[PDB]
């Protein structure tokens, strides 16, 4: 239907978030191999957002190391969209059982109007009202993930 | 150490490969939902290459649908680097057991000098001599995947 955020808008916001992550993780001072920022990507839709974000965080002095879902290290969980927050709440708690060092959440699209439980992400790229969107990893039955922009799908499509 | 291919060089080659994939898959005429090009991404290093490639293939009229590793549909397997070809050979044969429609391989970095078995990819972004490279998804012990370019690592690093 209509475009909510373009690839240029997302990358601009992700650069601003990257500068915050660079400043907030300075006293940890991340270096490759020895002390990398462990990136936990929640498949599938997060792979587009994860691929761009790690290439931007490296541009800002933050070396990263990625893991894919579905101790003593600093963990940043990345998900494409934050809606009911039921999946991210279970993932964060499951990662706290391994006892890291500092765990935070970074989402690309946050829909606060769809929460089933209270949950706040430490870093949010953009906010979206309670409407169904596709693109930038988001799908409707495994399609439209490859759209470079976050758009609202036509009702006749679904 | 030195840079072999930059992000600009890769995306330029990936646009040329995308035009070939668009022409070679015309008689299949891919449409979203009903007839999508099934993208099989081999984790982990392929996630950077997969995220860029699906956003380029959509730019060329090729809608895609992604699956991640580690019937009757057209399948294109994507891997970050092609070296011994032992993993990709086993993956292709395992996907042929599901009886698709047309299966091909697309790799970002092909090292022909490291083959343990004969294997040719249908689509290759760039060729690299038998040297250890990092960046663009490639790693040395889960680090340096976030480098925007394919570079050779300093020997003192490893
Ligand atoms: O706006 C959207 N666009 C794409 N996916 C969404 C959107 N809102 C929720 N989802 C995802 O849809 C799934 C929930 O759908 P359900 O499992 O059919 O109830 C979860 O993976 C959500 O992250
Ligand atoms: O040039 C390289 N850069 C990054 N990874 C490589 C390179 N060459 C081979 N690999 C990967 O290294 C792995 C093989 O290493 P091994 O399992 O220690 O023998 C496979 O996943 C290969 O794809
Ligand atoms: Mg999600
Ligand atoms: Mg879905
Ligand atoms: Mg590989
Ligand atoms: Mg490796």
Curated annotation (Swiss-Prot), chains A, B:
| Keyword Glycosyltransferase attributed | yes
The note on the cofactor says: Binds 2 magnesium ions per subunit. The magnesium ions are essentially bound to the substrate and have few direct interactions with the protein.
Binding positions for GMP? Answer: 44, 79-87, 111, 139
The record's listing under Gene3D superfamilies reads: 3.40.50.2020
Q: Which UniProt keywords apply?
A: Cytoplasm, Glycosyltransferase, Magnesium, Metal-binding, Nucleotide-binding, Purine salvage, Transferase
Q: Which domain of life is it from?
A: Eukaryota
Q: Which Pfam families match?
A: Pribosyltran (PF00156)
Task: Identify which residues the record assigns to the active site.
Answer: 83
Residues engaged in binding Mg(2+): 139
Q: Which cofactor does it need?
A: Mg(2+)
What this protein catalyses is: IMP + diphosphate = hypoxanthine + 5-phospho-alpha-D-ribose 1-diphosphate; GMP + diphosphate = guanine + 5-phospho-alpha-D-ribose 1-diphosphate
Record-linked InterPro entries: HGPRT, Hxn_phspho_trans, PRibTrfase_dom, PRTase-like
According to its UniProt record, where is this protein located? Cytoplasm
The answer to whether the entry has keyword Hydrolase is no
Cite the annotated pathway: Purine metabolism; IMP biosynthesis via salvage pathway; IMP from hypoxanthine: step 1/1
One GO molecular function term of this record is: magnesium ion binding
Matches recorded under SUPFAM superfamilies: PRTase-like (SSF53271)
What role is this protein assigned? Converts guanine to guanosine monophosphate, and hypoxanthine to inosine monophosphate. Transfers the 5-phosphoribosyl group from 5-phosphoribosylpyrophosphate onto the purine. Plays a central role in the generation of purine nucleotides through the purine salvage pathway.
- Give the record's family classification: Belongs to the purine/pyrimidine phosphoribosyltransferase family.
The protein depicted here goes by the name Hypoxanthine-guanine phosphoribosyltransferase
């Amino acid at each position: 239907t209509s475009v909510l955020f373009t690839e240029a808008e997302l990358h601009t916001r992700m650069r601003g978030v990257a500068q915050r992550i660079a400043d907030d993780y300075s006293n940890c001072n991340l270096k490759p191999l020895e002390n990398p920022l462990v990136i936990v990507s929640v498949l599938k839709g997060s792979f587009v957002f994860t691929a761009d974000m790690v290439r931007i965080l490296g541009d800002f002095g933050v070396p990263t190391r990625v893991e894919f879902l579905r101790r003593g290290k600093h963990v940043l969980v990345l998900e494409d969209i934050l809606d009911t927050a039921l999946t991210l709440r279970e993932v964060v708690d499951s990662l706290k059982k391994s006892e890291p060092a500092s765990i935070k959440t970074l989402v690309a699209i946050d829909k606060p109007g769809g929460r089933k439980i209270p949950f706040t992400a430490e870093y949010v790229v953009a906010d979206v009202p309670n409407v169904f969107v596709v693109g930038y990893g988001l799908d409707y039955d495994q399609s439209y993930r490859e759209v470079r922009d976050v758009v609202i799908l036509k009702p006749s499509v679904y």
